[PDB]
Amino acid sequence: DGAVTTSQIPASEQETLVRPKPLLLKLLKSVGAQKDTYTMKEVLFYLGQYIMTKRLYDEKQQHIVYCSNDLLGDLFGVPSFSVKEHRKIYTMIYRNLVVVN
Amino acid sequence: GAVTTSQIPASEQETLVRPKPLLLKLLKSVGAQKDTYTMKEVLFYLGQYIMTKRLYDEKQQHIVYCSNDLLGDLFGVPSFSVKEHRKIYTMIYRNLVVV
Numbered sequence: 662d663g664a665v666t667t668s669q670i671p672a673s674e675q676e677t678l679v680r681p682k683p684l685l686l687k688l689l690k691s692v693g694a695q696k697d698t699y700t701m702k703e704v705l706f707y708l709g710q711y712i713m714t715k716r717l718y719d720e721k722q723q724h725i726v727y728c729s730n731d732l733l734g735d736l737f738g739v740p741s742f743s744v745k746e747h748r749k750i751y752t753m754i755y756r757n758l759v760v761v762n
Numbered sequence: 763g764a765v766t767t768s769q770i771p772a773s774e775q776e777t778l779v780r781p782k783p784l785l786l787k788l789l790k791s792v793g794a795q796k797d798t799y800t801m802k803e804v805l806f807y808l809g810q811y812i813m814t815k816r817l818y819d820e821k822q823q824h825i826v827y828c829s830n831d832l833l834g835d836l837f838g839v840p841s842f843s844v845k846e847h848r849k850i851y852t853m854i855y856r857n858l859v860v861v
């Protein structure tokens with residue numbers, strides 16, 4: 662299973678095991694995820710998959726994602742965001758999941 | 763899909779190309795349906811291929827290790843930097859056939 666690491670977020674935090682809520686789980690499965698429980702790295706991996714495959718990044722500024730009017734925009738609750746602002750991105754993903762025990 | 767740059771003239775990114783069979787197969791493995799693409803479109807599918815297979819280095823995410831992968835056979839290097847767009851265009855241009 663794919664996973665991505667960032668240098669901006671503590672390791673132990675990236676390794677948290679989590680259970681996506683239904684909308685998020687549906688998004689992940691739409692890009693090939695098979696399971697119900699993931700580390701946060703694996704969640705970041707499949708969301709990268711999704712952004713890429715729907716070409717949500719802006720053609721001119723490819724670090725800006727326009728998620729407005731898209732399921733991702735629903736989940737995150739913003740029209741757009743920068744892929745450089747990782748803590749921000751973790752904050753947005755968190756309300757869409759439950760931590761496992 | 764489609765993607766573009768700014769180290770390469772935008773006109774040139776729109777150039778219409780016909781990948782050779784191995785490169786075409788690589789593109790088919792990530793969902794490309796056509797025989798001919800814009801260079802932008804080819805780049806887009808190559809970026810997807812690299813993302814999906816995690817060819818990029820874990821730490822240095824702008825470095826791609828293609829050694830021992832079909833991508834390496836095509837490109838003829840074991841690694842390269844995604845920031846060197848001309849070098850990447852050149853590698854792709856060597857893997858086309860004529861429409």
Ligand SMILES: O=C(O)CCC(=O)NCCCCCCOC(=O)c1[nH]c2cc(Cl)ccc2c1-c1c(-c2ccc(F)cc2)ncn1Cc1ccc(Cl)cc1
Pocket residue numbers: 664665666667705706707708709710712713716717718723724744745746747748750751813818823824844845
């Ligand atoms: O040329 C330059 O100057 C810059 C080029 C460059 O450095 N490119 C490197 C791209 C590396 C991509 C590695 C894989 O990344 C991911 O899996 C990933 N997952 C994400 C999920 C979200 Cl919600 C947002 C972004 C990404 C993302 C990604 C992306 C990305 C950009 C556009 C796109 F369509 C897909 C992914 N770029 C870097 N990353 C790494 C990353 C990891 C964790 C976090 Cl919290 C944020 C970012």
Ligand SMILES: O=C(O)CCC(=O)NCCCCCCOC(=O)c1[nH]c2cc(Cl)ccc2c1-c1c(-c2ccc(F)cc2)ncn1Cc1ccc(Cl)cc1
Pocket residue numbers: 718723724744745746764765766767805806807808809810812813817818823824844845846847848850851
């Ligand atoms: O997290 C951070 O702090 C910084 C991260 C960041 O800035 N991310 C930028 C967003 C990534 C953009 C994704 C869309 O890009 C592509 O479609 C693309 N296609 C390629 C084909 C090859 Cl052979 C190599 C790289 C890419 C690539 C890509 C990538 C990339 C990096 C790692 C990866 F696994 C996949 C794509 N990063 C930027 N790009 C843009 C780009 C466009 C044209 C050319 Cl000639 C070179 C690069």
